Design an enzyme around this catalytic site. Sequence first.
Site, PDB file in Angstrom:
ATOM      1  N   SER A  82      12.335  -0.549   6.244  1.00 20.97           N
ATOM      2  CA  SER A  82      12.347  -1.910   5.664  1.00 20.97           C
ATOM      3  C   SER A  82      13.516  -2.742   6.217  1.00 20.97           C
ATOM      4  O   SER A  82      13.542  -3.113   7.396  1.00 20.97           O
ATOM      5  CB  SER A  82      12.452  -1.832   4.145  1.00 20.97           C
ATOM      6  OG  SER A  82      12.019  -3.056   3.569  1.00 20.97           O
ATOM      7  N   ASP A 209       0.730   7.092  -8.691  1.00 17.48           N
ATOM      8  CA  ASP A 209       2.040   6.555  -8.334  1.00 17.48           C
ATOM      9  C   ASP A 209       2.283   5.242  -9.092  1.00 17.48           C
ATOM     10  O   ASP A 209       1.458   4.325  -9.019  1.00 17.48           O
ATOM     11  CB  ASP A 209       2.107   6.310  -6.818  1.00 17.48           C
ATOM     12  CG  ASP A 209       3.531   6.121  -6.303  1.00 17.48           C
ATOM     13  OD1 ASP A 209       4.329   5.418  -6.954  1.00 17.48           O
ATOM     14  OD2 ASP A 209       3.847   6.679  -5.232  1.00 17.48           O
ATOM     15  N   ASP A 229       1.684  -3.676   3.838  1.00 18.69           N
ATOM     16  CA  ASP A 229       1.974  -2.452   3.105  1.00 18.69           C
ATOM     17  C   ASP A 229       2.346  -2.745   1.648  1.00 18.69           C
ATOM     18  O   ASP A 229       2.821  -1.868   0.930  1.00 18.69           O
ATOM     19  CB  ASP A 229       3.066  -1.634   3.835  1.00 18.69           C
ATOM     20  CG  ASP A 229       4.443  -2.326   3.891  1.00 18.69           C
ATOM     21  OD1 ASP A 229       4.760  -3.222   3.075  1.00 18.69           O
ATOM     22  OD2 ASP A 229       5.258  -1.915   4.741  1.00 18.69           O
ATOM     23  N   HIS A 251       4.356   0.425   1.197  1.00 18.12           N
ATOM     24  CA  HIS A 251       5.781   0.328   1.470  1.00 18.12           C
ATOM     25  C   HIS A 251       6.587   1.557   1.098  1.00 18.12           C
ATOM     26  O   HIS A 251       7.463   1.963   1.867  1.00 18.12           O
ATOM     27  CB  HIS A 251       6.373  -0.906   0.810  1.00 18.12           C
ATOM     28  CG  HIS A 251       7.623  -1.384   1.471  1.00 18.12           C
ATOM     29  ND1 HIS A 251       7.650  -1.785   2.790  1.00 18.12           N
ATOM     30  CD2 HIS A 251       8.896  -1.474   1.021  1.00 18.12           C
ATOM     31  CE1 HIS A 251       8.887  -2.099   3.121  1.00 18.12           C
ATOM     32  NE2 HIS A 251       9.663  -1.920   2.068  1.00 18.12           N
ATOM     33  N   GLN A 257       7.480   8.208  -0.984  1.00 14.42           N
ATOM     34  CA  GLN A 257       7.794   7.879  -2.391  1.00 14.42           C
ATOM     35  C   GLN A 257       6.528   7.335  -3.110  1.00 14.42           C
ATOM     36  O   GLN A 257       5.633   6.827  -2.433  1.00 14.42           O
ATOM     37  CB  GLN A 257       8.930   6.855  -2.463  1.00 14.42           C
ATOM     38  CG  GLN A 257      10.284   7.425  -2.008  1.00 14.42           C
ATOM     39  CD  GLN A 257      10.958   8.334  -3.050  1.00 14.42           C
ATOM     40  OE1 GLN A 257      10.359   8.652  -4.077  1.00 14.42           O
ATOM     41  NE2 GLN A 257      12.187   8.779  -2.844  1.00 14.42           N
ATOM     42  N   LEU A 261       3.806  11.305  -3.718  1.00 13.39           N
ATOM     43  CA  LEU A 261       2.471  10.849  -4.119  1.00 13.39           C
ATOM     44  C   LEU A 261       2.006   9.780  -3.131  1.00 13.39           C
ATOM     45  O   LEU A 261       2.499   8.650  -3.127  1.00 13.39           O
ATOM     46  CB  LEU A 261       2.471  10.324  -5.565  1.00 13.39           C
ATOM     47  CG  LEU A 261       2.751  11.323  -6.702  1.00 13.39           C
ATOM     48  CD1 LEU A 261       3.001  10.573  -7.992  1.00 13.39           C
ATOM     49  CD2 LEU A 261       1.604  12.306  -6.877  1.00 13.39           C
TER      50      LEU A 261
END
Length: 285
Positions: A82, A209, A229, A251, A257, A261
Amino acid sequence: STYTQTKYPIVLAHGMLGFDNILGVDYWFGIPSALRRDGAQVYVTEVSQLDTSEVRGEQLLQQVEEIVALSGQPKVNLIGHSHGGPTIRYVAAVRPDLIASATSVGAPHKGSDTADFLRQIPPGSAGEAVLSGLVNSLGALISFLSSGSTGTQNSLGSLESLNSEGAARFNAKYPQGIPTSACGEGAYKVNGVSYYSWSGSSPLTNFLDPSDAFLGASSLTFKNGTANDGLVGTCSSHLGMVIRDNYRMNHLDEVNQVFGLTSLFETSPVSVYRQHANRLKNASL
Ligand SMILES: *[P@@](=O)(CCCCCCCC)OC[C@@H](COC(=O)NCCCCCCCC)OC(=O)NCCCCCCCC
Ligand SMILES: [Ca+2]
Protein backbone atom coordinates in the site's frame (compact mmCIF):
# COMPACT_ATOMS: atom_id res chain seq x y z
CA SER A 1 15.13 -25.53 1.06
CA THR A 2 16.93 -22.63 -0.69
CA TYR A 3 13.82 -21.69 -2.75
CA THR A 4 13.51 -18.26 -1.10
CA GLN A 5 17.22 -17.67 -0.44
CA THR A 6 18.05 -14.28 -1.91
CA LYS A 7 21.59 -12.95 -1.97
CA TYR A 8 20.34 -9.64 -0.54
CA PRO A 9 17.97 -9.43 2.51
CA ILE A 10 14.21 -8.95 2.05
CA VAL A 11 12.98 -5.79 3.75
CA LEU A 12 9.24 -5.52 4.36
CA ALA A 13 7.66 -2.03 4.52
CA HIS A 14 4.06 -1.63 5.75
CA GLY A 15 1.30 0.72 4.60
CA MET A 16 -0.86 3.43 6.20
CA LEU A 17 -2.05 2.56 9.77
CA GLY A 18 0.45 -0.29 9.49
CA PHE A 19 2.92 -1.85 11.92
CA ASP A 20 5.47 -4.68 12.20
CA ASN A 21 4.08 -6.84 15.05
CA ILE A 22 1.51 -6.29 17.80
CA LEU A 23 1.77 -8.74 20.72
CA GLY A 24 2.64 -11.72 18.45
CA VAL A 25 0.36 -10.73 15.54
CA ASP A 26 2.26 -9.87 12.34
CA TYR A 27 1.09 -7.28 9.78
CA TRP A 28 2.49 -9.64 7.18
CA PHE A 29 0.57 -12.68 8.49
CA GLY A 30 2.66 -15.83 8.06
CA ILE A 31 4.84 -14.13 5.44
CA PRO A 32 8.23 -13.55 7.28
CA SER A 33 8.05 -17.13 8.63
CA ALA A 34 7.31 -18.66 5.19
CA LEU A 35 10.07 -16.59 3.56
CA ARG A 36 12.64 -17.44 6.27
CA ARG A 37 11.75 -21.15 6.07
CA ASP A 38 13.47 -21.57 2.71
CA GLY A 39 16.54 -19.30 3.29
CA ALA A 40 15.47 -15.60 3.10
CA GLN A 41 16.84 -13.02 5.53
CA VAL A 42 13.77 -11.00 6.41
CA TYR A 43 13.69 -7.65 8.13
CA VAL A 44 10.28 -6.25 9.06
CA THR A 45 10.51 -2.50 9.44
CA GLU A 46 8.30 -0.09 11.31
CA VAL A 47 7.68 3.30 9.84
CA SER A 48 5.33 6.16 10.82
CA GLN A 49 1.69 4.99 10.55
CA LEU A 50 0.42 8.34 9.29
CA ASP A 51 2.62 10.85 7.45
CA THR A 52 3.89 11.74 3.97
CA SER A 53 5.73 9.31 1.71
CA GLU A 54 8.93 11.38 2.02
CA VAL A 55 8.96 11.33 5.85
CA ARG A 56 8.12 7.62 5.92
CA GLY A 57 10.71 7.01 3.18
CA GLU A 58 13.37 8.89 5.17
CA GLN A 59 12.61 6.69 8.21
CA LEU A 60 12.88 3.52 6.13
CA LEU A 61 16.14 4.87 4.64
CA GLN A 62 17.72 5.18 8.10
CA GLN A 63 16.63 1.60 8.89
CA VAL A 64 17.91 0.28 5.54
CA GLU A 65 21.25 2.02 6.15
CA GLU A 66 21.30 0.30 9.56
CA ILE A 67 20.57 -3.10 7.98
CA VAL A 68 23.30 -2.63 5.34
CA ALA A 69 25.84 -1.26 7.78
CA LEU A 70 25.35 -4.07 10.30
CA SER A 71 24.65 -7.28 8.41
CA GLY A 72 27.53 -6.67 5.97
CA GLN A 73 25.24 -6.85 2.91
CA PRO A 74 25.68 -3.99 0.31
CA LYS A 75 22.11 -3.98 -1.10
CA VAL A 76 18.60 -5.07 0.07
CA ASN A 77 15.33 -6.14 -1.57
CA LEU A 78 12.50 -3.80 -0.68
CA ILE A 79 8.89 -5.00 -0.64
CA GLY A 80 6.20 -2.48 0.28
CA HIS A 81 2.44 -2.85 0.70
CA SER A 82 0.00 0.00 0.00
CA HIS A 83 1.64 3.25 1.22
CA GLY A 84 4.72 1.02 1.54
CA GLY A 85 4.86 1.39 -2.25
CA PRO A 86 5.74 5.12 -2.55
CA THR A 87 7.73 4.72 0.72
CA ILE A 88 10.17 2.13 -0.78
CA ARG A 89 10.37 4.24 -3.96
CA TYR A 90 11.76 7.23 -2.00
CA VAL A 91 14.56 4.99 -0.70
CA ALA A 92 15.22 3.52 -4.16
CA ALA A 93 15.21 6.92 -5.85
CA VAL A 94 17.53 8.82 -3.47
CA ARG A 95 19.77 5.85 -2.58
CA PRO A 96 19.75 3.36 -5.54
CA ASP A 97 23.25 2.15 -4.61
CA LEU A 98 21.79 0.41 -1.53
CA ILE A 99 18.70 -1.08 -3.23
CA ALA A 100 18.66 -4.18 -5.47
CA SER A 101 14.91 -4.18 -6.05
CA ALA A 102 11.72 -2.34 -5.16
CA THR A 103 8.48 -4.35 -5.32
CA SER A 104 5.04 -2.83 -4.65
CA VAL A 105 1.97 -4.79 -3.46
CA GLY A 106 -1.39 -3.01 -3.85
CA ALA A 107 0.24 0.42 -3.93
CA PRO A 108 -1.68 3.57 -4.96
CA HIS A 109 1.18 5.12 -6.94
CA LYS A 110 -1.22 7.23 -9.02
CA GLY A 111 -3.70 7.61 -6.17
CA SER A 112 -6.60 5.92 -4.43
CA ASP A 113 -10.19 6.79 -5.40
CA THR A 114 -11.11 6.36 -1.71
CA ALA A 115 -8.59 9.04 -0.77
CA ASP A 116 -9.93 11.22 -3.65
CA PHE A 117 -13.45 10.64 -2.26
CA LEU A 118 -12.32 12.09 1.11
CA ARG A 119 -11.36 15.38 -0.66
CA GLN A 120 -15.10 16.18 -0.58
CA ILE A 121 -14.51 17.22 3.05
CA PRO A 122 -13.82 21.03 2.86
CA PRO A 123 -10.25 22.10 3.87
CA GLY A 124 -10.02 23.56 7.36
CA SER A 125 -13.57 22.48 8.28
CA ALA A 126 -14.90 20.86 11.46
CA GLY A 127 -15.29 17.57 9.57
CA GLU A 128 -11.60 17.59 8.59
CA ALA A 129 -10.53 18.34 12.17
CA VAL A 130 -12.54 15.42 13.56
CA LEU A 131 -11.64 12.92 10.76
CA SER A 132 -7.91 13.70 11.04
CA GLY A 133 -8.04 13.73 14.84
CA LEU A 134 -9.77 10.34 14.84
CA VAL A 135 -7.48 8.62 12.32
CA ASN A 136 -4.51 10.18 14.19
CA SER A 137 -5.86 8.54 17.37
CA LEU A 138 -6.06 5.15 15.67
CA GLY A 139 -2.50 5.54 14.31
CA ALA A 140 -1.35 6.60 17.80
CA LEU A 141 -2.98 3.46 19.27
CA ILE A 142 -1.36 1.21 16.65
CA SER A 143 2.01 2.83 17.35
CA PHE A 144 1.69 2.34 21.12
CA LEU A 145 0.58 -1.34 20.86
CA SER A 146 3.48 -2.00 18.49
CA SER A 147 6.37 0.07 19.55
CA GLY A 148 5.42 1.55 23.01
CA SER A 149 5.18 5.19 21.82
CA THR A 150 2.41 7.37 20.34
CA GLY A 151 4.72 8.46 17.47
CA THR A 152 3.99 11.51 15.32
CA GLN A 153 0.66 11.20 13.58
CA ASN A 154 -0.20 13.26 10.50
CA SER A 155 -3.20 11.76 8.66
CA LEU A 156 -3.61 14.86 6.46
CA GLY A 157 -0.13 14.09 5.14
CA SER A 158 -1.06 10.42 4.49
CA LEU A 159 -4.22 11.36 2.63
CA GLU A 160 -2.35 13.98 0.55
CA SER A 161 0.27 11.40 -0.49
CA LEU A 162 -2.47 8.84 -1.22
CA ASN A 163 -4.79 10.98 -3.38
CA SER A 164 -4.42 11.37 -7.18
CA GLU A 165 -3.13 14.96 -7.00
CA GLY A 166 -0.49 14.41 -4.28
CA ALA A 167 0.56 11.03 -5.70
CA ALA A 168 1.16 12.82 -9.04
CA ARG A 169 3.28 15.46 -7.22
CA PHE A 170 5.35 12.61 -5.66
CA ASN A 171 5.59 10.76 -9.00
CA ALA A 172 6.93 13.92 -10.65
CA LYS A 173 9.74 14.14 -8.07
CA TYR A 174 10.55 10.37 -8.06
CA PRO A 175 9.53 8.93 -11.53
CA GLN A 176 11.59 5.69 -11.39
CA GLY A 177 9.62 2.60 -12.48
CA ILE A 178 6.35 4.62 -12.88
CA PRO A 179 4.35 3.89 -16.09
CA THR A 180 4.22 6.77 -18.62
CA SER A 181 0.84 5.45 -19.75
CA ALA A 182 -2.30 5.32 -17.57
CA CYS A 183 -2.27 1.51 -17.08
CA GLY A 184 0.82 0.00 -18.74
CA GLU A 185 4.18 -1.03 -17.32
CA GLY A 186 7.16 1.02 -16.17
CA ALA A 187 10.91 0.59 -16.82
CA TYR A 188 12.07 -2.77 -15.38
CA LYS A 189 15.43 -1.49 -14.10
CA VAL A 190 16.34 2.14 -13.31
CA ASN A 191 19.72 3.09 -11.75
CA GLY A 192 20.56 -0.51 -10.86
CA VAL A 193 17.24 -1.04 -9.07
CA SER A 194 14.80 -3.62 -10.42
CA TYR A 195 11.13 -2.56 -10.17
CA TYR A 196 8.20 -4.96 -9.74
CA SER A 197 4.52 -4.88 -8.76
CA TRP A 198 1.40 -6.91 -8.06
CA SER A 199 -2.12 -6.35 -6.66
CA GLY A 200 -5.59 -7.86 -6.46
CA SER A 201 -8.89 -7.07 -8.19
CA SER A 202 -11.48 -8.64 -5.86
CA PRO A 203 -12.92 -6.47 -3.01
CA LEU A 204 -14.92 -9.50 -1.73
CA THR A 205 -13.10 -12.83 -1.20
CA ASN A 206 -14.07 -14.39 2.16
CA PHE A 207 -17.38 -13.65 3.89
CA LEU A 208 -15.90 -14.84 7.22
CA ASP A 209 -13.34 -12.02 7.17
CA PRO A 210 -14.59 -8.87 9.04
CA SER A 211 -12.55 -6.55 6.78
CA ASP A 212 -14.49 -7.66 3.66
CA ALA A 213 -17.45 -5.53 4.80
CA PHE A 214 -15.24 -2.42 4.95
CA LEU A 215 -13.46 -3.23 1.67
CA GLY A 216 -16.67 -3.99 -0.21
CA ALA A 217 -18.25 -0.73 0.98
CA SER A 218 -15.14 1.32 0.15
CA SER A 219 -14.93 -0.29 -3.30
CA LEU A 220 -18.04 1.70 -4.23
CA THR A 221 -15.85 4.85 -4.31
CA PHE A 222 -14.54 3.33 -7.57
CA LYS A 223 -17.01 3.99 -10.39
CA ASN A 224 -17.07 3.02 -14.09
CA GLY A 225 -15.86 -0.56 -13.50
CA THR A 226 -12.39 0.57 -12.34
CA ALA A 227 -10.80 -2.70 -11.13
CA ASN A 228 -9.69 -2.48 -7.51
CA ASP A 229 -8.80 -4.30 -4.31
CA GLY A 230 -11.25 -2.24 -2.26
CA LEU A 231 -8.91 0.71 -1.70
CA VAL A 232 -6.45 0.69 -4.61
CA GLY A 233 -7.04 0.58 -8.37
CA THR A 234 -5.23 -2.00 -10.51
CA CYS A 235 -3.92 0.66 -12.94
CA SER A 236 -2.73 2.85 -10.08
CA SER A 237 -0.78 -0.10 -8.61
CA HIS A 238 1.57 -0.48 -11.58
CA LEU A 239 5.31 -0.17 -10.98
CA GLY A 240 7.98 -1.61 -13.27
CA MET A 241 7.28 -5.22 -14.19
CA VAL A 242 3.70 -6.15 -13.39
CA ILE A 243 3.50 -9.78 -12.19
CA ARG A 244 -0.35 -9.73 -12.03
CA ASP A 245 -2.60 -6.84 -10.99
CA ASN A 246 -5.65 -9.14 -11.07
CA TYR A 247 -5.31 -11.68 -8.24
CA ARG A 248 -8.58 -12.74 -6.53
CA MET A 249 -7.49 -10.68 -3.51
CA ASN A 250 -8.62 -7.60 -1.64
CA HIS A 251 -6.42 -4.96 0.03
CA LEU A 252 -5.93 -7.05 3.17
CA ASP A 253 -5.55 -10.46 1.46
CA GLU A 254 -2.44 -8.97 -0.17
CA VAL A 255 -0.82 -9.22 3.29
CA ASN A 256 -2.69 -12.47 4.19
CA GLN A 257 -5.11 -10.63 6.52
CA VAL A 258 -7.33 -11.04 8.54
CA PHE A 259 -5.59 -14.11 10.03
CA GLY A 260 -5.14 -15.91 6.72
CA LEU A 261 -8.81 -15.70 5.66
CA THR A 262 -8.49 -15.30 1.89
CA SER A 263 -10.16 -16.72 -1.25
CA LEU A 264 -10.04 -20.48 -1.60
CA PHE A 265 -10.50 -20.11 -5.38
CA GLU A 266 -7.07 -18.46 -5.46
CA THR A 267 -3.56 -19.51 -4.45
CA SER A 268 -2.23 -18.41 -1.04
CA PRO A 269 -0.82 -14.80 -0.84
CA VAL A 270 2.01 -16.41 1.12
CA SER A 271 2.91 -18.47 -1.98
CA VAL A 272 3.00 -15.30 -4.13
CA TYR A 273 5.68 -13.82 -1.81
CA ARG A 274 7.57 -17.12 -1.90
CA GLN A 275 7.49 -17.22 -5.70
CA HIS A 276 8.67 -13.60 -5.77
CA ALA A 277 11.65 -14.23 -3.48
CA ASN A 278 12.59 -17.09 -5.84
CA ARG A 279 12.22 -14.81 -8.90
CA LEU A 280 14.61 -12.32 -7.21
CA LYS A 281 17.06 -15.16 -6.43
CA ASN A 282 16.90 -16.25 -10.11
CA ALA A 283 17.55 -12.61 -11.13
CA SER A 284 20.75 -12.98 -9.05
CA LEU A 285 19.48 -10.55 -6.37
P1 LIG B 1 -2.64 1.60 2.23
O1 LIG B 1 -1.44 2.16 2.83
C1 LIG B 1 -3.19 3.04 1.49
C2 LIG B 1 -4.44 2.44 0.76
C3 LIG B 1 -5.37 3.68 0.22
C4 LIG B 1 -5.92 4.55 1.37
C5 LIG B 1 -7.32 4.96 1.71
C6 LIG B 1 -7.37 6.33 2.53
C7 LIG B 1 -8.52 5.88 3.51
C8 LIG B 1 -8.45 6.54 5.08
O2 LIG B 1 -3.49 0.59 3.11
C9 LIG B 1 -3.00 -0.21 4.27
C10 LIG B 1 -3.90 -0.31 5.51
C11 LIG B 1 -5.47 -0.12 5.24
O3 LIG B 1 -6.06 0.70 6.29
C12 LIG B 1 -7.28 1.29 6.03
O4 LIG B 1 -7.77 2.23 5.22
N1 LIG B 1 -8.34 0.61 7.03
C13 LIG B 1 -8.99 1.66 8.16
C14 LIG B 1 -10.04 0.71 8.84
C15 LIG B 1 -10.39 1.61 9.93
C16 LIG B 1 -11.37 2.24 10.69
C17 LIG B 1 -12.53 1.91 11.61
C18 LIG B 1 -12.10 1.39 12.99
C19 LIG B 1 -12.53 2.69 13.67
C20 LIG B 1 -12.27 2.70 15.21
O5 LIG B 1 -3.70 -1.77 6.10
C21 LIG B 1 -3.73 -1.55 7.55
O6 LIG B 1 -3.83 -0.44 8.18
N2 LIG B 1 -3.63 -2.56 8.55
C22 LIG B 1 -4.49 -3.96 9.28
C23 LIG B 1 -4.88 -4.28 10.65
C24 LIG B 1 -4.47 -5.62 10.58
C25 LIG B 1 -4.68 -6.29 11.99
C26 LIG B 1 -5.87 -7.24 11.68
C27 LIG B 1 -6.40 -7.96 12.91
C28 LIG B 1 -7.60 -7.03 13.34
C29 LIG B 1 -8.24 -7.80 14.72
CA1 LIG C 1 -8.94 -11.38 3.85
